[PDB]
Every structure is written in structure tokens, then in C-alpha cells.
Amino acid sequence: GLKKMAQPSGCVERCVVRVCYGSTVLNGVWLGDTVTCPRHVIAPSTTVLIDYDHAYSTMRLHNFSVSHNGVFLGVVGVTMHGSVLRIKVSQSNVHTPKHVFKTLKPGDSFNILACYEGIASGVFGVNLRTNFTIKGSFINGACGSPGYNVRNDGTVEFCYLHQIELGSGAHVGSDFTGSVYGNFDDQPSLQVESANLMLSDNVVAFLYAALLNGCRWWLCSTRVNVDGFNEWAMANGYTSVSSVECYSILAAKTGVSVEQLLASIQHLHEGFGGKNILGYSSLCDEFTLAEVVKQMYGV
Amino acid sequence: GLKKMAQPSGCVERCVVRVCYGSTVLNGVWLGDTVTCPRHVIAPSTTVLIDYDHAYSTMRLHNFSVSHNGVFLGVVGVTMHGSVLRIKVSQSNVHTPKHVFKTLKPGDSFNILACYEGIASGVFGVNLRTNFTIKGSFINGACGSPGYNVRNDGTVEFCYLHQIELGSGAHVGSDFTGSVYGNFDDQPSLQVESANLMLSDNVVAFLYAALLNGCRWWLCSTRVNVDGFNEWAMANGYTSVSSVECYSILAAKTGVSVEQLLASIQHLHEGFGGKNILGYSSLCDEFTLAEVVKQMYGV
């Protein structure tokens, strides 16, 4: 069985703050004596292009208001790093978790804590897509909502700060160094993301989960090797497959090689007409190998 | 957009404890000076039918171990209430949230905090089906994982304790009074749940969500009234629709009457062939009216 789940949010909830500059309000993340938030908070109200260098030069500290659960924090200084601000505050968060900062790569799964006015409202798992966007559920005010992962030793990896929604509905964020994923602009514009590719590593994991649930009507006895599959994937909207050996735990429990699943992807690429696999009517790239193994075996 | 999300888990994480009796380990929920957990924890190791009254009669308090983050709570007394135990402990949980106990009805959405050995591992939203099961993701050791909702005023509604996985893969739990949802047996058996019905209320909410995203190819021009739909619903595996008055906010913005959606359900009852609605190839009863309203408008 497979369910997209989030890792527990409690340690991240204790870091979320409300950041206001003038009338503009969004979310930030308070670790130690630093609050990180999108620099959009200092943008002037205007319909023309934002000159953030100018806004930063004219910025005054007294225009900031930063609070955690309605308790206001004093602002000591502010510096700008790409698309984020680093706000130094006059006291440290006593609930700062053990943490690091990590930049995601396409195909990485992570957790979003959707926040509004410094208050978390929801949490869900997501995948960074090949076009460097995610499919979230955000409404007005979610800017600065953090993305995270929790390592096995309990270390929180801070990896995402929500920045903008594109005209297509795709969501764009930055890492905590201020680099926007996919090099999108952090202000309204007419930019469009590139076509989404199916995450082949995730589809292989999905088909192994199907096999382990007794669903195998689709299984191909043909084999396609990695080099051949990667050339096919180029022409058919799929990513390369990264490797084969990481699936050995599932290859052994089933009797099925990764190369058989690569052939099966090519066989199922257009549709199931009109059967289903684990309830899905087309191939699913929602679940990583790590998620399948964790949810099926606890590893 | 429509995404299944969970409400943040921090306030519930601080209530999960590890409950051990002999060698048997599961999860409990620590509120005030009471820990509630499934009575399965006192079951003998055997393949015969469990007599829980006899297990309770032979129980010894010193066989219990109850711990939070590796520190042990002194057990003072234990009573059995249906399928749960209420363990009195000598310390109160200083992180007990404002809370009530609520019994779910089919069609209700709630959050599951999946836990193992008293430690939370995942959080996800589920919906109670008409056969009083949920489709979660659990492996061995998840017994006692709590289900909750958080009210607008901050009150946590505790509504579910995970009990068993059926042969089908569906999951069964109890409420905090010890009543098993659907009155399934809380021990290994061959029980088969009745077939699920489509939750018509949730399908209506889902079609309102599609309208608000410009997805309208499926809208019937004609209408069916509630009485006519409910007659059809019996014959075709759908629940009766509750009322038309609830959807007025959706009926306003769209602005489509519930009767037009009920007619659309009748036409879309068979497949979409081969179109899709918000990515789905069939009607989705995953989302309640409250969820759609909260996710679209923050209310």
C-alpha cells in the first residue's frame, strides 16, 4: 500500500514566524537569532518591475515587524542574499532543532508546511519536478512557507522557501541561500516552466509496489537495458533511470529485474486501456524508491 | 488546485507514548494523567481466539512499561473500555492540548499520525468510508496511532486509534471510548467489510472545485432533483446526497446549482472516456465540502 505522507511537522512549526514590512506580510523561518524570508516582503506596491537593489538600499529596520505566535521579536539587522533576506533578531529561538541547509535536485521528495501569517495550516509531501516546480496547494499569503526533510538521525534539512505561483499554477521556491529553483524571477512576470518529465526512478518503484501487492497483469518479459531505456526516455517524456542496483531489495522479493520494468514502462507508456495498477489509470511517478521501501517494510 | 493535506501534527506528537506489556509494544495517547491505547497490548501470544476479559482479569500492573522520549511514567491503574485501555499514570502531560473526544461519521475527513514504538513517523489526511474503514499506510507496530482534527478555535478533536488491518488491506480503528468503527473485531480474523459506496456529498464538493479551475467540459445543462438522485444513488452504489443548502458558497461562486452537479454525476457515472477532471479519470470522493472551501478560500 502507498500513501503520500508528510514527515511530522512539530519541530518546524516551532520555527515559523510572521514577517511584515510596511503593509506586506509573509512567512519566515527562525533558527538561532536569524529569520530567513523571501525578499518580496520589502517590495514596493507597484505594477512595474521591482528593483530589489533599490528597495534594499532604502529599507529601514523600523518598518519590520516579526512575531512568533503573536510575540514580537526585535530586528537588529538585515542582509539580502539572492531572493531571501536574513533578518537578525535580538533573541534566539530556544526551540531551534538540529538542522542543516540542503539544496534539492529534481526527483527529490520533501515536505511543505503551508503557512499563513506565520501560522501553519497544512502539511503535505511533494516532489521537485524536472522543471524545478512543485504542485502545491497554496493561496494568497503562503509566501515563505518552508520545505524540509527529517534525516534518520533527526537532523532537519531546510530546503525550500515558497516564492511565487506561475501563471500555469506551478509553484516556485528558493533554497535558504536565496537561489531560486530553476532560476525563475521572484516577482510577477510572464515566465513559463519547461515541460514536466515523468520521473522514471519513481515509476520503477511504483511498479515494484504493484508487484508486491499481487498486481502483475502488465509485467513484460522483455528486457530493455539502461542505455536503451534512456535513449527511449529522451523521445517519450521520461527522465533517464539513474541506476539499477538500488532496487535489489525489491528485485529479490519479486522475481523481476529493473530491466523488465523498463520494458514494461515502454509497454504502458500511453495508457492501460482500460485496466488499472493500484487504482491508477496511468503510470504513477509520485512515490520514490525510499518511500516505497519505508512504507512497505519500514526501512 | 486540490491536494489532500494533513493539519499540522505538533500538538499531537507531544501526546504519543510507547506502551509495552510483556513483549508486546504499541502506541498510546497521553492526555492529562491518562494514557489510552488499544487493548491488544495485553493479548497473549497465541493463534486461538483472544479472550480479552480473561486477559484483563489476569493483568498485572508491573508488566506495563509506559515511556515518552525514553523516560518512564509510573502506572497507577488500568481499566478496559471496549477495545481500549485507560492507563492512569502518576504524571500529567504538561503538553496536553485543549481537546475533546469526537466520534466520526462516514464521509468525515481527519488526520492520521502514524507512529511506531511511541514515535511519530508520518502524517496524512484520510476520509472515513461508508464501511467504516480507512485507506491508510501502516506496517507492523502502528497500532494505537491516533487520528485527530483541529478546530478553528484550536481545540484538538481526538477521533481515532488505529486497531487492525483487514485481509483486504483496509484499516480499522476505534474511538477513544473504545467503540470500534464498524464494530469489527479487534483481533486477527477472517472478517470482510461490506463494499464501499461513493460519498455523494464529497463528489459534489469535488465537482465544485473543478468548476472553480475552469474545468467544465463535463457540466450537464440539465438538472436532477435530490429525490430523483437519491433513488438513482441506491441503484448505483452512491450514498444519498445530504442537502443543497451547504453548497451555496460554492453554488454562488460557480454559480451552479447542486441539481446540475447531481445530473452530471449520473452522466459521469461511467468513465470519462477518455477525458479527465483535475487529473482524475473517475469521480473522486476524497474531499469534503469543508476541505474544498478551506483550500480554495481559506475559510
Output the keywords.
7 helices; 3C-like proteinase (chains A, B); 19% helix; homodimer; 6-stranded mixed β-sheet; 299 residues; alpha+beta; main proteinase (3clpro) structure, domain 3; Thrombin, subunit H; 7-stranded antiparallel β-sheet
Task: Walk me through the structure.
2 copies of one chain form a homodimer. Chain A is α+β, with helices and mostly antiparallel strands and 299 residues long. Chain A contains 7 helices and 13 strands. Chain A has helices at 10-13, 52-57, 200-212, 226-234, 248-253, 258-268, 289-297; strands spanning 16-21, 24-31, 34-38, 64-68, 71-73, 75-81, 84-89, 99-101, 109-116, 119-127, 146-150, 156-165, 171-174. In chain A, the strands form 2 sheets. In chain A, strands 5-4-1-2-3-7-6 form a 7-stranded antiparallel sheet, with no helix packed on it. At the A-B interface, α1, β9, β10 and α7 of A face α1, β9, β10 and α7 of B.
User: Shape of chain A from CA axes?
Assistant: elongated
Query: Which structural class do you get from the secondary structure elements of chain A?
Result: alpha+beta
Sheet with most strands of chain A = 7 strands, antiparallel
Secondary-structure element order of chain A, as H and E? HEEEHEEEEEEEEEEHHHHH
Q: Strand order across the biggest sheet of chain A?
A: 5-4-1-2-3-7-6
Oligomer: homodimer
Roughly how many Å apart are the termini of chain A? 15 Å
What is the CATH first-level class name of the domain at 200-297 in chain A? Mainly Alpha
CATH architecture of the domain at 200-297 in chain A, by name, is Orthogonal Bundle
How much of the sequence lies in strands of chain A comes to 25-35%
Largest interface by residue count? Answer: A-B, 36 and 36 residues
Helix content class of chain A: 10-25%
Instruction: List how many beta strands of chain A DSSP finds.
Output: 13
CATH-defined topology of the domain at 200-297 in chain A: main proteinase (3clpro) structure, domain 3
- Name given to the CATH homologous superfamily of the domain at 200-297 in chain A: main proteinase (3clpro) structure, domain 3
What's the helix count of chain A? 7
Task: Please state the CA-atom Rg of chain A, rounded to the nearest Å.
Answer: 22 Å
